[PDB]
Design an enzyme around this catalytic site. Structure first.
Site: not given
Ligand SMILES: Nc1nc2c(ncn2[C@@H]2O[C@H](COP(=O)(O)OP(=O)(O)O)[C@@H](O)[C@H]2O)c(=O)[nH]1
Ligand SMILES: [Mg+2]
Lengths: 297, 379
Positions: A24-25, A103, A216, A255
């Protein structure tokens, strides 16, 4: 028991190397630089072209074939990513003591599966993937590094970066210290060799009087290197260690990461007695003056 | 690589993972939902006008909130302090949540491969309990060869707090998530909250998937979904020629081979008072067409007042690299200065090729020298 293969990192003029991806090259280019540098390259392998000659060396179809014919003890891999992990497996099968995979771009899942098997044995030692390789200045060069900037010396270099390693090499030569063994462990998350492995060799190598560690931002590798040094490099025959962490001025979904550094990497290395150079152009001078502060010149 | 939520939700649904019924729009005006959920679509977490996610019972309200989201930036704990400009929003069939749980599948170096990570105290800010109570975090290391075992899925679902008929249901969803995790060559599949509806349905309400770039050659359909809208046009165009671009706030463009070396280049420019505008990693492969294109992109940005070329250890003889810059510079008539540092095979000849061309090219000996020359040329 995979630690038993650490010793195979210390290549020398007696190391007999073969190149996977020979025709190979990239394999041809670095195989030619290796020969010009004096590396004992005894052939290579490419499926379907075994037996013929390439760069004046024999070509083989499999790794075990080249090993049984040439008695090779090290292998360098330039196979493309889709088949590089399997190229590593082929060498572990043949029980090649040292395998260096240059690689870049191997899927993480592939390497996770390779490393799964790699850790259950202790006959093959892997460096990489996505690394520049290993070089014993003046004796053996298995990788892509420019050989002309190296020179057999007293500083053991380990680097998680690629080209950045060459700055530490070029500087240690200009200051008259040279390098005893330079190892590039690569920048992939799942690799066959880490910082501590190379530190274990440097600390027990008499020819290695000083140590330079190139790191780094990102990950926990530099921190683990610090803890290792704080235990085994603090006390009687403590060897001086210097380091540089790239990305001090670099800018910063989910997270998971927070659950399972830059500023903190530096603080951790200093706690183990490592002198961290803030400028990438002062690695040679810092280690030099450290030798001066210890009457090691 | 990371995709939007609506792109991950569809991918999860096709592999047997229970998800909500969603729709995506670009305007506030654009289901039979008893209750609707409005969620800003950005490649970042912590989205929770204040708040990136809202709950209402019928449409009308969504049209009033979607105006305050679309076109505006959403600054979370994991977004740049400026925030991330919100372009899309999600309107989905909202479901009730009896329990919020955290669950993730990722390749972890410490775990030597895949590992399930969950906590019964999930939802919103999982990272709090992680630092607060390290005991509320659970880990099941999975064997890449044997795969996820039924016992492991049951133990995680048991530690996540799924009891009764939900335990076996959750464990089945965990299995489908791990298999999906492997199928799509993912580095991280995070579901937070890994919810539990009052009807007894284990559902993945939110999804954050990180994809392994190295697997693109076998994930064609998945990487075709990358919108690329959240990246600067300069980045996308740089990637066309296999050049990874990263912009900064400065006036000195950088052209380097190696990410580690490029960061050190930016680091040492700061040390001498300069601020690097950008930094374009050329990688291992060095096609003399890239250097031609490289200057075209770096010069396009008006903030560029100087270009720093630092090539150490290129695969190609530096002489060939010297000829590519001269003609590339000549064909386009570069206005800004150019500091060139080359190192590799046959460099003594390569350097004179630069300065003996009658072009505005200043050669540098090492890295520290190249930096001081760059900050000096911007006076
Ligand atoms: N009851 C209910 N809560 C929701 C729903 N979707 C998101 N949440 C609420 O949204 C909040 C944050 O969740 P999410 O939007 O999934 O994640 P983010 O990226 O941190 O905003 C939490 O308190 C969840 O309970 C839903 O369909 N029903
Ligand atoms: Mg979430």
């Amino acid at each position: 028991s995979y630690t038993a293969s650490r010793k195979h990192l210390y290549v020398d003029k007696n190391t007999k190397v073969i190149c996977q991806g020979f025709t190979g090259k990239q394999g041809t280019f670095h195989s030619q630089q290796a020969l010009e540098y004096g590396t004992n390259l005894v052939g290579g392998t490419t499926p379907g072209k075994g037996g013929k000659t390439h760069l004046g060396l024999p070509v083989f179809n499999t790794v075990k074939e080249a090993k049984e014919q040439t008695g090779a003890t090290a292998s360098v891999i330039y196979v493309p990513p889709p088949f590089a992990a399997a190229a590593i497996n082929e060498a572990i099968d043949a029980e090649v003591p040292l395998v260096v995979c240059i690689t870049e771009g191997i899927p993480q899942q592939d390497m996770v599966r390779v490393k799964h098997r790699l850790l259950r044995q202790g006959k093959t030692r892997l460096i990489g993937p996505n690394c520049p390789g290993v070089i014993n200045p003046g004796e053996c060069k298995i990788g892509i590094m420019p050989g002309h900037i190296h020179k057999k010396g007293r500083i053991g270099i380990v680097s998680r970066s690629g080209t950045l390693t060459y700055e530490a090499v070029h500087q240690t030569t200009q200051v008259g210290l040279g390098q005893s063994l330079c190892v590039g462990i690569g920048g992939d998350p799942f690799n066959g060799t880490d910082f501590t492995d190379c530190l274990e060799i440097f600390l027990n190598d008499p020819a290695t009087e000083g140590i330079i560690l190139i790191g780094e931002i990102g990950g926990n590798a530099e921190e683990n290197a610090a803890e290792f040094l704080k235990q085994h490099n603090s006390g009687p025959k403590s060897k001086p260690v210097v380091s540089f962490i790239a990305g001090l001025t670099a800018p910063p979904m989910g997270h998971a990461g927070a659950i399972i550094g830059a500023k903190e990497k530096i603080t951790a290395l200093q706690s183990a007695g490592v002198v961290v150079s803030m400028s990438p152009a002062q690695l040679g001078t810092t280690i030099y003056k450290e030798f001066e502060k210890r009457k090691m010149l | 690589m990371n995709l939007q939520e609506y792109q991950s939700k569809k991918l999860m649904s096709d592999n047997g993972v229970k998800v909500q019924r969603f729709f995506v729009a670009d305007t506030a005006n654009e289901l039979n939902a008893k209750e609707i959920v409005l969620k800003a679509q950005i490649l970042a977490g912590g989205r929770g006008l204040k708040g990136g996610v809202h709950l209402t019972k019928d449409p009308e309200v969504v049209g009033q909130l979607a105006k305050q989201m679309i076109g505006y930036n959403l600054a979370t704990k994991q977004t740049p302090k400026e925030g991330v400009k919100v372009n899309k929003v999600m309107v989905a069939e909202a479901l009730d949540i009896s329990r919020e749980t955290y669950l993730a599948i990722l390749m972890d170096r410490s775990c030597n491969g895949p590992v399930l990570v969950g906590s019964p105290q999930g939802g919103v800010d999982i990272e709090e309990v992680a630092a607060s109570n390290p005991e509320l975090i659970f880990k099941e290391q999975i064997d890449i060869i044997e795969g996820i075992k039924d016992s492991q899925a049951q133990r995680m679902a048991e530690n996540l707090g799924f009891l009764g008929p939900l335990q076996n249901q959750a464990a089945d969803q965990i299995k489908k998530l791990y298999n999906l995790f492997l199928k799509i060559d993912a580095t991280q599949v995070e579901v937070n909250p890994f919810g539990e509806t009052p009807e007894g349905q284990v559902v993945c309400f939110d999804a954050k998937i990180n994809f392994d770039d190295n697997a693109e050659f076998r994930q064609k359909d998945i990487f075709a979904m990358d919108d690329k809208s959240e990246n600067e046009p300069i980045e996308n165009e740089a990637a066309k020629y296999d050049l990874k671009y990263i912009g900064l706030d400065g006036n000195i463009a950088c052209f380097v081979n190696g990410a580690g070396l490029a960061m050190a280049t930016c680091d040492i420019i700061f040390l001498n008072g300069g601020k690097p505008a950008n930094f374009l990693d050329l990688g291992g492969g060095v096609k003399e067409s890239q250097v031609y294109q490289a200057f075209k992109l770096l010069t396009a940005d008006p903030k560029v007042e100087a270009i720093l070329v630092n090539i150490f250890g290129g695969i190609v003889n530096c002489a060939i690299i010297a000829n590519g810059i001269t003609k590339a510079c000549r064909e386009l008539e570069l206005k800004v200065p150019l500091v060139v540092r080359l190192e590799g095979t046959n460099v003594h000849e390569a350097q004179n090729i630069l300065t003996n061309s009658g072009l505005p090219i200043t050669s540098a000996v090492d890295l520290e020298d190249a930096a001081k020359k760059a900050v000096a040329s911007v006076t």
